[model samples]
Target chain A: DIQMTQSPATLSVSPGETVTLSCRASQSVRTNVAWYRHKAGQAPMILVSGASTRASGAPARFSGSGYGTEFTLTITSLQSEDFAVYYCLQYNTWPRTFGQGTKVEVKRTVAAPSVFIFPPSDEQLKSGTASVVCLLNNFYPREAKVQWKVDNALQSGNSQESVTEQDSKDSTYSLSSTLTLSKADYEKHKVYACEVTHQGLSSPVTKSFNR
Target chain B: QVQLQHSGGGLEQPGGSLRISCAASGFTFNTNDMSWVRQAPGKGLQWVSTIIGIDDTTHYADSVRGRFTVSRDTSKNMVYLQMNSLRVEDTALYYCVKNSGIYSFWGQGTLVTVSSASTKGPSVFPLAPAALGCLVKDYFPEPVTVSWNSGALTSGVHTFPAVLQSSGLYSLSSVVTVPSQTYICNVNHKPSNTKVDKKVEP
Candidate 1:
């Protein structure tokens, strides 16, 4: 695993001004690299990957250009997210990887998110509409997932992804996801895994439910 | 009263099918239960599909049900999985297990894993740019250990304690007055023997 090198503790910039961040890998990472960003309280989001490809929904202002051991993540117009922290990671091999990290902070650092899960409860021929829901509140950057597993088996069917909504005025994203099940599915009493992998918090927000 | 023996090769073409057979021995086939278990190359383990060998009743993970068919043979005393419409993503290390309330035996895993698709590291945020302590959080899956490094020297650094949050991850609000510009944090994800370090004069 190769860590990235980012200099400058803070990159002071204004709106409409582009900010350039540098990242150098210990070894030639080739195209196995990516850039990620987020405000102090938003979902940790991906900006670029494979050293050059831009992720979907990534603002055009965010871009990556570089090769092998040296790479650059350039934000054409800096929107005020100095609360922003920059991270570099390599996907080339096992052991998985990430660079130490560098932030583009402004005034106050955002606190980590508060996460919770809600499972469906209902009566149905009434048709088991009771869905398992994972919610992340007061989180930043708009990044999260509600991963469902049936008995430890990653289950995705009937899973629903919600838009990262700005439910807070502090520029944080509140996200929710749902996984529906049937009465038979409930009676099965199989272990249900509700795993939330979000950028607002570290590790994975995981909680399992079942009889 | 029986065990499963796996017989399958490891590689598969992007769109080709992979058929892995786990032969059962020492017991009558149709009287027990068997299931196919898979693990994505290096990620996590998954219960691909299962069958109550006798009735051939099958239950598949919703994600791969259509792509897999679990079956068994009473005569050959064998349990099988015939998967089709394979994508490079279907590559996995497959194993077969016999279930009896609590699993007691499994077959040797067949290393058949993938690619052509994809999916960062940790970041150090200054709790307070002028403070002596920093916040180290969000690396991933535990056994992630953090320590302060001072250019070849590893002593005298005061670290509070790293918190293992409810998310099976870690966050550290540790202290260090060491002024080395490189007063950084070293994270060792022991499970994978992978390590990462970061330091900055915030």
Candidate 2:
């Protein structure tokens, strides 16, 4: 039986930051390598296999590329819910072997901080209705949770629902929260934030949209 | 769904032997290969070898070289594994499996331990002026070779045929003199391409 070993059992990454994980095989197993991610107490989810072909419903930002004994799993622009343990498996022979796993986290890095914002339209203000949509572009793990907050204080609102769907390359979720306020209240600048939480990594990330 | 049931003794004393049997059901007995595996406590699984059910051809893993033997009885659809010259390091859980390409389907293992025992004999048996007889029980797979050797005698040693029961057990009874001679019961099996011998003396 061929042996498989994974390194650096844990890692930390910040939101909007990129990080890479490594997997190695005892011998040259060619392109039979595959990757999987498992949250605490959940079944393993397949990530990459048969070399570089992405599995259906996987995220675009989570890409895998390599060959033979060495391979890499790269997650671009880490999300709040992207924290979990990752494993590599080889399907080349009987009695398959799995790597230990790598736990990912959110932490401070060398990257600079930048924010993007979108406010409610003029017509929405006239109708006495205000809404802010925080879009996390190129996101993965469609089932991840997304919450809405205003000025760092959680807003008590209704119709706070999230919709998740899968594409050929990735899975993503979009959420919308509605706040009914008077036109006078809509004139003042308010901060609306989106936060997401996932397994394995420490801390959630909050991205804000301002008026 | 095919399944296998394993039956055997727990452990064998040092200088003694251990035998285990894997009885298979739910599928054609001769269609697929039956395999055996050993796993030490809290360790990875190790392949012991396999037996082709059709012709009874057997193969052994290199690590288990001279310690084990595999055989099968087509009439009963049962496969057997035996280990002799027991040692403490040989203690492990043995499993019966079906040989599939990617993953061999395994049965829950049977733990076997090797220990030490003392030699003793039964005090009461008829000393034969006419015929002598002996019977052995609980031997796995029930087929054995029984022979008697007389010390410094030229010829005239008689032998009798053994009987195999319906449950795959064997009984042999032979008549001989009350003299210093050796009576042996040997198990017949194939380890690899060659036939190996496991003998018991009484």
Candidate 3:
């Protein structure tokens, strides 16, 4: 079996911070080094391969760079949603071997801290239209699905969104959906939820907002 | 899309032998070379041996000899490995492997165990307490040596013959008087060479 070694077994970072993980092979494995992120109870998802080529639908923020025996997996712009364990794998031989994983956690400075919303609130909006945005962070190789729900019921007519590449992190992804409602159907008590689904996690998180 | 399956008996009684087989499907059997590897309980993996499909040449690892034989049925595209001289230490998970010279493929695994049993046989001296005095069958290529040691033992080369059965299998028997004795066997082949030592105790 090919030997794989990983560094920084675990790491903690605050929001907006960037971190990098490294993996090395016992011998020159040509270019078969690949990266995978294994959160808690999900299967491993391939992030980067052939050393640097990102898998389809991966976010730009998460980029893989390196060759031969040395490789790196960089995650840029830590977000509250970006906290999980990641690993590197080598497929150069039979009985593929995996390196020890690295865990990333959100860095909280104070205890029992008050919650703070980034934009405060978007108070102004039309009565007949509803918009919801889903952002997935702290994930590498960006493979996830976003869905919209109205009053706990699933909604259709959504388009795929691309995640922008961060200069410092590995990758991130986000999606948004716009729903058209009748003036009479829009009410103050109605609920709108955005759910993000990705591998490595047990279930998707539904972010509900008051309309 | 090819898948392989292995089936074999578990925990053979001491003084008896066990045979295992590897069955393959979904690919041309002759295109690949099927091999076998053994993992002794929680220990590291060890390469037992390999069989070439083109020429039916069997290669054994340096550490495994005498007690094991590897063969294949090219017509059935199946490979077989028979391990003899049932002992407590021979218990382990044996796996079938495929090789193309550089890379090696593997099958799931089959666990085989060698346990103790009560059977009356022969009064062979130190070789094995449960000796049945069985005649030596066909000894392949040449004969291997068997020795005895009572106290501080040393190593040397010796020659012993085996009986060849009508079914084309080889068997051998020996008698010695030593509490903790050792028997060493050596074989020379074209591609690779192998030697093995078996320790016997009362």
Candidate 4:
């Protein structure tokens, strides 16, 4: 990979501003370049690649292109979540190299998780089991914990969680978790509850199926 | 249809050196190629180096530069990655892969912890194509869940399965020929609250 020299150590702008970041390749890397972004607790991620192609789930306002030996990552009306660090990688050479990184500073939003109930499957009720999708919605920052209860004792295993999803509009996020139980266990226990706790929240949000 | 079996690198020390190997089968060794890669704390992958089996030539990612090396033995169909002067940041899941950046086969990540070493997540926008793209990456320590919502997906929307990356992480992708104007992508990293609903506009 070719050596990449990037410009600007820090970019400060409002949430609705436009920004440009550039990196020059020591040699022509053609279109074998990719730009990645990173946040505090989050991992590094690719934003654009092949010089002009956007990576999966890239936003509309974000764009990538190259001029001669210099590649650029441009963000139009940067979103709140866009406030992070950025880097460039050139994959067209022998020793793939990366640009140091550019930090984007902006006001980030923090929202608490909401509650949604998908209730137990009616088919499961008719059969001999019950399954429910307990969703914690509209949260920011992407890390939350959930507690499931069948009446009182903690419920464990035979559960599934959907990945975290971010809103393209406001940059908020949501997540869902599913729990399954035999019909006998469902009636014997008779009540189901899901409790969520975010370190930043004042108190845990607990929702119940009986409601 | 080559098979890749990844192994080793479970432990390393700051100044110590180590070597891990990947066992390949079902393909000709001498004529093919393989690369050594890893997913640090977050399982975000970083390519260490690659070996062109036929000529024994090597390519390194400038990021790792001279810190690592890739070697292979044609007769045994085995490839090895040797790293010197490991650091706390050196700890990560390591594995080998074949192909031209488009991985065809991979060995399950073997966690390589450098004891004291610890640690280590993107989304698409609407403009260019009105097509929303969300990226969920660098998931490690087992399950890294990702979810997406786009109003109601048109009756029959197609979801692309997350591509398991060479560095032990997975990239999430979904393009519905018929997605609403907007979509939501999530990965709470929380045990139960991992669902992101794609509510259709009213």
Candidate 5:
């Protein structure tokens, strides 16, 4: 299968500015590329299909071009609503692939997240295992990294992270991570810590749980 | 004449299991393959699995190999997707498409929500002999639609948007006037893709 990648990762723009995003497939996809626009908490909106054909209801400001492995999606006059993450999909092969996504963002203040860790209850331990949940709340700019540590050593392999959730009312984002361990392991570990890194924070925020 | 109707989405608790399906028509089921693709709530599309109807061979995404299964029945002209150990993050709209490397036809898509929130279909109440009320309450994820049997009765019918309650669920209300002394109210909740029909008798 061919791989799909997008360039520049992110684009910073203001209202009325024009910007063009790029998507490249490892091999020729011909004209089978489709473009979509996605905002937080909403379904992705199809913008272009069959490479350059504008989808129904798509604005004239949005245009697509290019063939083979290289493609471009250009916005002639960006509106506030046009500021969203864009993705390119190549459907010429099995296991259809999507580009990494180019986030077109408007400059704004970054909101730092509030971190909290919830320890497992007795009922959780009775099941022979437990899950420790770390929650990050009310952050902006959309991306954050989470790490777990036990007894000052980095933890791995037994944890899961949730996708970021955007608040409907405010558009702020939140995320959750869970660390699962056996009852014996949970009792054996004296301390557990969760650390989050984001552009909003000058320093990573760390929260710890003590037995 | 090609038609694909997908179903098998519903409200389920986290950590449970679910099975969804796609029913195809207007094409040969044994000769063509089907691809299963999904988009999580507020996320981009991803291909989850596919089934080759000719040999019943299957392929799956890395994230869902162990917990997800894809299968089909030639006799029924249907494809199925079974999910195990479900999580809230699995809430998504699952789509099925006729695939031969690329999609030529697509299904309407089925919506599945994994959450602890209650799933209650709308309950119909007769406000009066000439008035009927439909109330849908305590459901998560938005976008529910209401319709009547009278075929586009515009006057004396009103529907309000879904409102978030203090319990984190949503509630919606619709009222329609009865001209035939009886009416059937159909309410469809998108998250579960389930419909409730209530008939009123004067």
Candidate 6:
């Protein structure tokens, strides 16, 4: 079986920029290469076949070239929709292998988020179980890392991030996470905190929940 | 409304043979192609074969090229896989896919197991500067032979007898020294008349 290696691993560029991705095989493949594009929540689609022939429906901006052990997939004047991962496959041998993939991420302006914490309600506390909720609003890149801390010690397995929702008005993303705790455990801790780390922030934003 | 159902996979001894059948319905079978895939335990999915519906053209992976046959029956809306020269490595869950990969419907996989009470075939490897090695493993009844290029260059060639593995199957190894040129390694098992070839190049 032949092995394929994709270079750069990740490529960061803005819209309208041109990018060329590289794929190298362990042995000569003689143009028996194909390229595919993949996006989140979408099925991967073939872009190039037989090394240089573009598959039907592939954009004119996309092209592939080269033969033997080296090949390249080039995208000219990248479109906003072209931000996704690209994979190269060699069909010259058995146990057909695929490259590790090169992720094309669009560079965009960053925005820090405002995080809010909602303490457990008294009625809920009386019931012996409660949830400490954390809300993050107006962030860029559509994602952030979230964690729960019980009295300054990182809590594991008790935290879950909610569905990420995009705000149409500001074009930012909003997300909420929760930490569930029993009354005994909740009362034993003086401060239950939620920490959010995003690429835009120099440091993580944390909010504490107090009784 | 497309549907695919599989039949004919089960336990079998090594050096044996079997067939798998897939029936398709709810659409014109000849309008789209059928694909076959397999997954070994703890391994990723492997493409076995594909038959283009319109032209009846067939494509197969190199590993199973000579040992497997894939064909379709358009009149019956059925597809078949003739699996031969069974080996332990061939044990996997086989599935039939409708209409290739996109918007495809898949059949429930049928488990194919090759046990020792159960047994296999051969693989080739190339070393640099260099000696070529041919390994035949998990086979039954020990009569086998390995030849490099039909005994063209017989010097520096060493062939060993089949060794019994702990699993009750047999394994054999043969090596040949060659220059920086291309050569073919062939392994033949007489019981099943199974033959496999691998091309090595420096």
Highest TM-score against the true fold, candidate: 5
CA lDDT scores, all candidates in order: 0.58, 0.53, 0.52, 0.62, 0.73, 0.71
Q: Write the per-residue lDDT of candidate 1 for residues B1-202, one digit (tens) a residue.
A: 5667888744444556767788898766678878676655223344577787556677776667688898887888777788777776676667686642123356777766333221113434432222243444444433355576634545433333333333334444443434334466676665445666655344
Ranking by TM-score: 5, 6, 4, 2, 3, 1
Q: C-alpha displacement of A120 in model 3, angstroms? A: 67
After TM-score superposition, the amount by which residue B195's alpha carbon in candidate 4 deviates from its true location, in angstroms, is: 28
Summarize candidate 5's per-residue lDDT along A1-211 as a digit string, tens digits. 7788898887866678778899999999999998878765544567887888877668899899989999999898798788788989887776678887888876546899777765665544666756666666667877889899998889877766554334434556655566768899888888889999998899998988787
Please list the residue runs of candidate 2 whose C-alpha ends up more than 4 Å from where it truly belongs after superposition.
A1-25, A28-211, B53-55, B117-202
**Runs of candidate 4 exceeding 4 Å displacement:** A1-27, A33-89, A98-138, A141-211, B42-44, B59-67, B99-105, B116-202
Error of 3 at B106 (Å): 4.0
Question: B32 in model 5: Cα distance from truth in Å?
Answer: 14
User: Residue-wise lDDT of candidate 2 within B79-187, one digit each (tens)?
Assistant: 7888777775666778776652222245657678654422221111111222232222213322333334323422222222333323233223322334544433222
Q: Could you report the Cα RMSD, in angstroms, for every candidate shown?
A: 24.7, 32.7, 31.3, 14.5, 13.4, 24.9
Model 5: pairs clashing at backbone N, Cα or C within 3 Å: none
Candidate 3 chain A: worst-modelled 10 consecutive residues by lDDT: A112-121
User: What value does the lDDT take at residue B172 in candidate 3?
Assistant: 42
In model 2, which residue pairs have backbone atoms overlapping below 3 Å? A58-A170, A59-A170, B132-B175
The lowest-lDDT stretch of 10 consecutive residues in candidate 1 chain A is A121-130
Query: Which of the predicted structures, 1 or 2, would earn the higher TM-score when compared with the native?
Result: 2
Can you tell me the DockQ of model 3? 0.01
- Order the numbered candidates by lDDT, best leading: 5, 6, 4, 1, 2, 3
Q: Which lDDT tens digits does candidate 6 get at residues B1-202?
A: 7778789687777788989988999989976878777766434456788787889888887778888888988898888998899887888888787644331356778778776553245433332124554545446654577888876756655455454445466555454545545677777877556887766544
Q: How well does model 3 score by local distance difference test? A: 0.52
lDDT score of residue A46 within candidate 1? 67
Give stretches of model 5 more than 4 Å off. Answer: A8-17, A38-45, A76-85, A91-107, B1-4, B9-106, B111-202
Chain B TM-score of all predictions, in order?
0.53, 0.53, 0.53, 0.55, 0.62, 0.57
TM-score of 4: 0.40
For each candidate, the DockQ is 0.01, 0.01, 0.01, 0.05, 0.09, 0.02
Best by DockQ: 5
